[PDB]
Every structure is written in structure tokens, then in C-alpha cells.
Design a protein around this ligand. Structure first.
Ligand SMILES: [Cl-]
Ligand SMILES: [Cl-]
Ligand SMILES: [Mg+2]
Ligand SMILES: [Mg+2]
Ligand SMILES: [Mg+2]
Ligand SMILES: [Mg+2]
Ligand SMILES: [Mg+2]
Ligand SMILES: [Mg+2]
Lengths: 296, 295
């Protein structure tokens, strides 16, 4: 129970083992994108404008905590479109607010038009439609699976059922479909649109996020977390589960290395950069705080 | 030795059927097209593949189209124009799947896919259907001799079925079939591809078993039974049971979806099995309705 309410006893060791895995299997360190003050302010003002119809104010410190995943987990050496980068910054942030909101305040009529306005600001006409549909599908999925029997079944049955749910629910399909304009790389664009890009990266993103967001999520009655599949109060069982998940991440990373050079660079910067950001995000460091609290 | 699953044909067919009777129960049913409807479908198919220069016989079309007739969910059909579109799109992209890639002319074929979608679908639905068709034929082409395909199909079942979510065409299927039903929940699962991911393994394991002999003889590697030594009876049976286990788990989780959506999901998997066991394409290594379409 309370023994199952936290992965704190494993925090240091799992962090060390995560990093050791990346040093061995990815090697290349992720890179932080440095926005100018003008760029950061533009992103944040677009974020505020988009969530203002929903009546909640979001502090700069909160936005900065949301945006760090984009700053850390894109692929700076391959960036060609900084407008598409800023779009991903904004879209990520405003839908992370949605992910944190009480569903009672999920106003599709007010929010969906703001998502379209973002896409139309930053993307060409064709890209705007691809990014928008993926944003729409992400916020719709997050809404419709709150207290759903489907989510309960897919999250409590097996790791295979759980990660299949997370391809969409964690947002990585959305991410790939709004991020391919950053790179203008033909192969990457196709893997993004088939969702093979998302499926290749789902476990490495999800396992890392689930470990560090476990304590917050169980305190909030949130069940979408693979470590609820094991008794985290049982050290031996946890260790076995955790090794199985490292094995999952490793197999994925090695198969990702079969993709073309630019595509695998982007895929691996995403997985490894998310890890680096996750270990520095105060959202993931106490059960409830001013940057991870539920938005009432 | 590993060239054939023929020794297991009878047992595996019986066990598939037993599994379905225990876990699905509800039988699929065949859509009966009128003569005019079937002729409209076949005319559109021929018109679409005509620019590619290879004639396709009525018998071959009827072979391709059976999967749509058997694997939709007739109780819930509301839009027979969308149904006919799925018939045409399935068949013409099946021809593409059988073609030598030297014959893959995107500039001639892609506008034929758009013309089909624009005939049968509303404007939003036509874009969704067309994008999925484009994605399907581009994937089939770009993976024909790709190291990515080798890596995903030789590493583990997990990597293989991940590749099949697109390659077998099921994501395509869901995104062009939701208009048949106009069921709001089904439409969203189609668009997230959750629908496709729930049904991939039950469709792929069946198709792989019955297309193994043909595929191995053409040097096609996209088949999960190449992950086991099919010449080792003990190893095969262990592998085959693990695949039955996968289908069973998927089906039991599908039953958590809403009633109509799960009817559609399970009719797809079980109807595909019914059609596969009566399609002559899946009965010899090469015959006149499964031969490679070479240049
Ligand atoms: Cl949750
Ligand atoms: Cl193949
Ligand atoms: Mg979430
Ligand atoms: Mg969350
Ligand atoms: Mg989380
Ligand atoms: Mg194929
Ligand atoms: Mg084939
Ligand atoms: Mg096959």
C-alpha cells in the first residue's frame, strides 16, 4: 500500500542505471536548444493566449517547466525550421496543461480553435493540418479515457497492452506528427506519418516518464503507469520488472539503429533528451507542487 | 525443411477455429453485393490500375475483395458507398502489394487513389482515406529491400508486429472503414490508430500462417513464423501457442471497448480468418491469384 505508493527507494539506483544504459547504447549526448528571450516570450504569450479561454492562468515558471522537454529532446544538429520548432514548443505546452486539467474544464469548443490558430501561425497549409489533427486526437483521447474501462483494461493487463495505449496517450505520435516539419527530412516525415516513428520510441519515452512520475500519479489516483503492473513495494519483484523494461528500451534502441542516420539521430535524441530533462524537472520531484499540481 | 507449414495446416486451422469459438462466439457474415455493385467495384479497380499496364482478371479481383466482404461488420453498416470504397481501395493496393517495385509508378497511381476517395467519401473522409492509402503504398514500396524491415522482422515478435501495424494494412483499413459505420467512438480509435493496434496481431498471425509457403518461396521475409524453426515440430508448437496467447489477450481486452466498436474489431479478426481459409491465394505456393506481378 504505502509501500506501493512510491518508487523513492529505487530513485538513485534506477537513475544511475538509466544513464548507464544510454552511455552504452546511444553514446551521443542530447543537446539543449537555447531560445532567445524574444523567442521564449513569443512561445509563452502564444501559450497564455491559447489556454486563456479555459480561464486558468499558467505562470512563466510553469510554462518553462513544460517546455523543457522540447528544448532537450529535439535534435539540434538537424533542425531546419525554427518556426516549426516554436509550434512544437507551444503545442506541447498547451496540451500538457490539458493533460493536467480536471476534465470538467475540457472545453473543446473553446480550445480546439486555439490549437488550429497555433498550427496555422507556424506551419504551411499541409503541415498545419497534420499537426492539428494530431493535436486534436491527443486532447480528445486524453479526455475520453479519463475513468474509462478501456484504459483500466489496457493498463492492468500486460506491458504489451499498456504500451500500445501509450503510443497515443503519452503523446509521442502527436509529437512526431508536429515535429517532422522541423527537419524536412523525407524518410523521417514518412515514419512520422505511418506512426512507426512513434511506435519505435514509445517504450523508451514511457518507461522513463513512468518511473519519475509514479509518485505524483498514484497520489492522484492516475493509473496510466507501467510500474503499477508490479509490486513496487517488493524489492525483488521491482528489480525484475525494471530489468525487463531496460531490456525493452535496449531492444528498441538497437532496432532504431537500423534506420537511416538522420532519422535514428532524431529518434535517439528524443529518448535520451527526455531522460535528461526528466531528471531535472521539479515536476517529477515531489508528489504535489506548483509545477505538477492538478489544474482544478 | 523450413520451406513449409503444410504439416501443421489441419491442426492449426482447427485450433484457430476453436480459439475463436471460445473467445468471440459471434460469427462473421458475408456482405452480399448486387451484380451492379460488384461491377461498379471491379470497373473502378480496373480503371485505377490500368495506368500501371498489368491486366487483372475478375477472378483475381474477386479473390482480393473477399476480405472486405467477410471482415466488415454487416449489422452496423450505414454507408454502402464507403463500403464500396473500401472494396476498391483494398483491391487496388493489394495489387500494388503484389507488384514488382519497378512497376510502382506513384505519379500514375496516387491520383487514381485520390479519385476513388473523392468519389465515395465526403471531403474530410476522402482526405483521411487518401492519406492512409498513400501511407500504405509508400510503406510497401520503401521497405521492399530495406535494412529496417530485416531488423524489425528478425529481432522479436514485438518488433515484428510493430512493423505490421502499417505494413499489413490494418491502420489503412480502419481509416477508410470508419465512415461505413459513423460510430463516434470507432471513428476516434481509427484516427488514433488504437483500433489498428488492437487488431494487428489477430490479423497478422492468421495471415502469416496461411501465406507462409507462398511468401517463403518468393523470398518475402515479413512473416512471424520465420522467427521460429518451422521444421522443428516442438519449437513450432511452442511458438504457435505463444501466438494464440497473443490473439486471446488482444480479444479479451477488445471486449472492454464499447459494444459496437468491439463487434467491428472482432468481426474483422474472425472474418479475416474465415475468408483466409477459403481463399485459394493461400493454398499453393504460386497459382494464378497470388503470383508475383513482375515487369
Ligand atoms: Cl491516468
Ligand atoms: Cl516481404
Ligand atoms: Mg497523460
Ligand atoms: Mg499526465
Ligand atoms: Mg507520467
Ligand atoms: Mg505486404
Ligand atoms: Mg503480401
Ligand atoms: Mg501474408
Amino acid at each position: 500500500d504505502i509501500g506501493r505508493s512510491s518508487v523513492r527507494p529505487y530513485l538513485e539506483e534506477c537513475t544511475r542505471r538509466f544513464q548507464e544504459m544510454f552511455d552504452r547504447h546511444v553514446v551521443t549526448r542530447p543537446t539543449k536548444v537555447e531560445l532567445t528571450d524574444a523567442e521564449l516570450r513569443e512561445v509563452i504569450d502564444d501559450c497564455n493566449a491559447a489556454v486563456a479561454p479555459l480561464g486558468k492562468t499558467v505562470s512563466d515558471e510553469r510554462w518553462i517547466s513544460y517546455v523543457g522537454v522540447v528544448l532537450w529532446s529535439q535534435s539540434p544538429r538537424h533542425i531546419k525550421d525554427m518556426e516549426a520548432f516554436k509550434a512544437v514548443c507551444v503545442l506541447n505546452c498547451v496540451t500538457a496543461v490539458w493533460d493536467d486539467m480536471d476534465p470538467a474544464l475540457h472545453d473543446f469548443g473553446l480550445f480546439l480553435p486555439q490549437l488550429r490558430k497555433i498550427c496555422e501561425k507556424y506551419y504551411g497549409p499541409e503541415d498545419a493540418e497534420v499537426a492539428y489533427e494530431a493535436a486534436r486526437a491527443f486532447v480528445t483521447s486524453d479526455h475520453m479515457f479519463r475513468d474509462s474501462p478501456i484504459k483500466a483494461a489496457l493498463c492492468t493487463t500486460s506491458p504489451e497492452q499498456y504500451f500500445r495505449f501509450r503510443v497515443t496517450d503519452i503523446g509521442v505520435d502527436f509529437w512526431m506528427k508536429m515535429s517532422y516539419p522541423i527537419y524536412r527530412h523525407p524518410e523521417f516525415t514518412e515514419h512520422a506519418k505511418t506512426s512507426l516513428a512513434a511506435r519505435m520510441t514509445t517504450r523508451g519515452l514511457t518507461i522513463v516518464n513512468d518511473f519519475y512520475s509514479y509518485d505524483r500519479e498514484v497520489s492522484l489516483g492516475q493509473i496510466t503507469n507501467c510500474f503499477r503492473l508490479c509490486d513496487v513495494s517488493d524489492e525483488t519483484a521491482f528489480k525484475e520488472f525494471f530489468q525487463a523494461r531496460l531490456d525493452d528500451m535496449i531492444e528498441d534502441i538497437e532496432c532504431i539503429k537500423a534506420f537511416d542516420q538522420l532519422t535514428q539521430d532524431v529518434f535517439l535524441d528524443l529518448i535520451y533528451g527526455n531522460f535528461v530533462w526528466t531528471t531535472s524537472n521539479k515536476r517529477y520531484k515531489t508528489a504535489v507542487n506548483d509545477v505538477n499540481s492538478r489544474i482544478q
